RNA sequence: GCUUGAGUCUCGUAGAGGGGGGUAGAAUUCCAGGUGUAGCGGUGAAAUGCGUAGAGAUCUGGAGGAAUACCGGUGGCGAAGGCGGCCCCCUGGACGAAGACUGACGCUCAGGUGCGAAAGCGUGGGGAGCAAACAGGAUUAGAUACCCUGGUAGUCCACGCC
RNA sequence: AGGACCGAACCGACUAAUGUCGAAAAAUUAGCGGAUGACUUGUGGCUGGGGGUGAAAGGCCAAUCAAACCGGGAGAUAGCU
RNA sequence: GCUCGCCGGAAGACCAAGGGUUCCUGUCCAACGUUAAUCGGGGCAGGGUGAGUCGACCCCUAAGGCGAGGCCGAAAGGCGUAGUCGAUGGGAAACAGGUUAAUAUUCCUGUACUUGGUGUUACUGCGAAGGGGGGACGGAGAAGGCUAUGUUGGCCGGGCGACGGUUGUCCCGGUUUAAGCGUGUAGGCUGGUUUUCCAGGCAAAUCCGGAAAAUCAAGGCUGAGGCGUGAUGACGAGGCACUACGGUGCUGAAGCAACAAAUGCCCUGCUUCCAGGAAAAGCCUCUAAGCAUCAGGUAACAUCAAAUCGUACCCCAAACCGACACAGGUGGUCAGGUAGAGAAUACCAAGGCGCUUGAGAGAACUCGGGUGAAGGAACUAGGCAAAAUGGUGCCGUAACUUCGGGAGAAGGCACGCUGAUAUGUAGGUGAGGUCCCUCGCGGAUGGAGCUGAAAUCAGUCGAAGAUACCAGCUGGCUGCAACUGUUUAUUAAAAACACAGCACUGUGCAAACACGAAAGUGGACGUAUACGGUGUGACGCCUGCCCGGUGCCGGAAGGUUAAU
RNA sequence: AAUUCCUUGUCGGGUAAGUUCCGACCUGCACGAAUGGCGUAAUGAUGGCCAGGCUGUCUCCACCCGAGACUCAGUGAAAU
RNA sequence: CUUUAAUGUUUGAUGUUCUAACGUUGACCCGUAAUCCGGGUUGCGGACAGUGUCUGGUGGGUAGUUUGACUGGGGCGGUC
RNA sequence: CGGCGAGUAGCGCAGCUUGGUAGCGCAACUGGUUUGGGACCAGUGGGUCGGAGGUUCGAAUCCUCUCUCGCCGACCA
């Protein structure tokens, strides 16, 4: 019975990262949809 | 040998391994070795293109000389080898003053013989020569397509292609499929049939021998449910249809050869 | 110890003896084109099948395939089954001729191993003609036949079996 | 030699009881099959929603699958309580 | 603190993943802990992570990813060469003791190793984005040699006993030591070497690959463990000086050999088989463009550095993931004693724990268990469960069969323990002396010493001797599937799926078929003894009959017919 | 027959007792050649059936350890 | 008009030869230290092939829907 | 209890759209051929459409309810 959130912080940074979301077109869309709401949790940087 | 395996247990009950006692039991000759990175079914867009296929045991592809452009240097066949890739096993042949190289073993060769490619060589097992200077009515293989390409025709184990006639600046070739074609007379080819010539009855015997060869299990189309293949679905093994591919084209039927950039060159197609 | 048994050795002679590579002529059924038009094939007589989408006919160019007219003669070989072109390789047996020779080593042989046409079988090559099967057309009181038009297993090669 | 045999680790999960607002949003305690193979697992990549993958059940894609999820269209529309 | 319980291939000890002060000290007990709490993984406050050598960073790649010019794409954007990134792999190097309330291969004591920089000196042909070699490899399977580690004895220190005997064949405790350095062994592969040449490695090449005469049978590379320096040092049972109840400081003997012994090491080694087993840098040698006294590289030596960050604690759990102080799920290394084939199981060591509700009485009922008179499936949808056989060695093994299997068919026979064979044999290992001695870690011989089966008899005890744990129910037919395997992850494990095989059919290469507007890749760096697809599904006996209709595959006479 | 409803078809066998079960009949409502026929050693957490074993599955339950239930003090929910 | 011979002169059909656009997952130097590509030679196909638009065919590979009502429940068979 | 399918001599069928005449193949039977059956070469006898109707210019025909035998469905909880 392995449970679903099976964590790893390198796989959380290659994918949900900053440099994972600043490269393409529709990652930059996400960071612009967040800082219009304007919250401190914009990515996963740490 | 052509050995029959003494059937101890289920899964040795049908195996036969067409094996050579004189294929060398050692190593690939390393300076002709580039690796291969396995790409089962999926192109560079991911996305499984060919079905039916997968992984299995690791290979290290051997660089095989096909053009044979030395044309005038004699060649000592050092040893045979088993390059696992095609079916037709390979023989390391060093030349007179230098480079060592792999060519297709043409079934008549045992190692130590002299061979030579070129327009000015003998008529023997293992000499490659352009079909202007050929004996007519022979039986050859490894035929090129253009004078300089290297070869695309009859290089699988045991096979052969019989030159039938000379059409002036053209040479027509009886292929071992039923169709026969017409190429210009300046293409290059080697006498005789290729080695591993009794690979034809290599029974695998078991699921196990397949799945480390690379073939991967494929399920029948009437087994599936109908959202998965057009034959799919059916309450108790009912076909009721007309046999088509996954994507729609009817098989056991319509001849979908329509390249038309090649229809110039087929003399007599297959009936 | 003997030589007439039987078997050796020495020059040769005739042959479709066996196994293995290739090779040549005639000729059939297809592939391709020209000349060319109502019939072709068929057995007793018909009708299937082929044909005005131009067959059959002939001529020109290829295709493989299998059999090797005539020489062929109760002729030559083989223990038998069976062997029919030529060619080169290997190689087996029968027999004549006179000398040298071992000096009965011979005859037969249930046990046994081996060979053994035809089809029949296994695996992979092969495919003309022909032909089990089978179909239709007649025939027939009925025709699961004899006849007719096509045709599949096989016929054929290597390799095991029988 | 072996998808060989009895059999642990491990992988799986056929059998009956308990649980079934439980110790757990499927597991425990005994018995059970495989167990150098078509093997299990570890980590890092690749695949996309009429599309992905599938030793093919319409099963699996985050406790949801005969077409996942979030936001927008959108107060969709409901003759029906 | 005493006593008793539990685990001991784990609930023990060290780490990655992950978490992020939970670690230690003094205090606080209002919330938090399925109660209390002078307690805590709860709060307050202080305090704790020392590296040239472990890891990361770093030199270099794999799957794979962005991806200059590009080809393509309506915009976005899709693909890709050059390139530059990406360890779960290759590249440099440290071990023993001590010590903190709490960290260590970091610090202090001791012995040292590793790659760079500068330069005195000695030499002097070096130098790629170039070439070559290596690093560079699989699976299985034994067997030989050893180490970890353990066991018995000797030595050495203390003991002889809170009821019988125990001055000796007697009890208990300790008998630790690395990297590195010198000598190179059991062991494996390998012919070295000198001259003269070569159309081979895109050119070049004193390298390497090849071809040829000479020359004697050696040099060399890799190499567990051993043996001494390491170490007249430390460690070391314990006893004493002090006595803050924690303990502090000096001193401190013996430190031996043999029997075993692996799954660890030589082993990236070797036999064998088919399913044919990763690429580049470090390091190594040889050239080009240059400089060619200068400059660069080699060697000895002296001297100077080795930036950065991670480390505290848990890490088979109360701290990671499961809404939680959850019987759940997570991967790798070390592996003790006695019986045991063992990493099964039984009981214990070091070492952690007693699963943060306890105290009574001992109803029905429920759950987990033990035996049960006589009987034996009568119960039931069905022997579901539960019960029972259950172990090595020796025999004795059916129908059928593909000749293998079947079959651990079935079925019975002995097991404890003392002595005798023999003051413990066979077998295993095996010092000195002796002898030749390529003066050795040699090679024969001899065999002390030390372990230790198995097997046969007598005899003796039990009621029962595989005594407990652990630990095969068994055959007689038949349906379906050939068979091991897979599936509804969470009500469906089989007859369903795959399967090796058989077949049809498509495919001649810028293949068909696919994923993409397209470029493109897959197929395949394969080319009809191979690839796609479909069907049925081991091997054995076989594959009847209809070509109508639906639909493909040939044909092009006619009728009909879109665009223009 | 895993297809055959109709039917417990009817006979042999096993039982004192046999809608399942083994062997055939042919009346195949509606088997039958690769939507494959028939057969098949071995194998299967497989589908029925049978004898032997063995036992609390049963006649018929009887006792008996231990965790709950119940009593006391602490703490203290939930469906509706 | 049926039927033939040649001529003038205009389409359309079919084939051979050819090179010059186009094709070239042929070779070969160069940009470039590069199995991408572009550029220039050379060989081979060759007005076909490929694509654009128009167009008949084919088209469950896909997408959007549609599949009455009374009815002594619904379906059936009626009736409308 | 209800659809689709019909009944033409012993046996089995065209006549039925759109009403007008009861034919046809094989049996009983008799004959030609042959020495004789059977077969071939030909004929005679065999019904007023299961039946009762009404309807009407005359009905197997046109319809309706019955006798019987086919066949189709008799389903969901």
Residue numbers in the entry:
A (entry chain D): 1 to 46
B (entry chain b): 1 to 271
Provide the authors' original text about this structure.
Structure VI lacks EF-G, but the tRNA positions and 30S conformation only marginally differ from those in Structure V. With a slightly more swiveled head (18.9°), Structure VI represents a transient translocation intermediate following EF-G dissociation. The completion of tRNA and mRNA translocation along the head requires an ~20° reversal of head swivel, to the post-translocation state captured in Structure VII. Novel states in the 25-s dataset with the most translocated tRNAs and most swiveled 30 S head capture a transient equilibrium between the ribosomes with EF-G (Structure V) and without EF-G (Structure VI), suggesting that EF-G•GDP can dissociate from ribosomes prior to the reversal of head swivel.
During translation, a conserved GTPase elongation factor—EF-G in bacteria or eEF2 in eukaryotes—translocates tRNA and mRNA through the ribosome. After peptide bond formation, the pre-translocation ribosome contains peptidyl-tRNA in the A (aminoacyl-tRNA) site and deacyl-tRNA in the P (peptidyl-tRNA) site, which must be translocated with their mRNA codons to the P and E (exit) sites, respectively. Using time-resolved cryo-EM, we visualized GTP-catalyzed translocation without inhibitors, capturing elusive structures of ribosome•EF-G intermediates at near-atomic resolution.
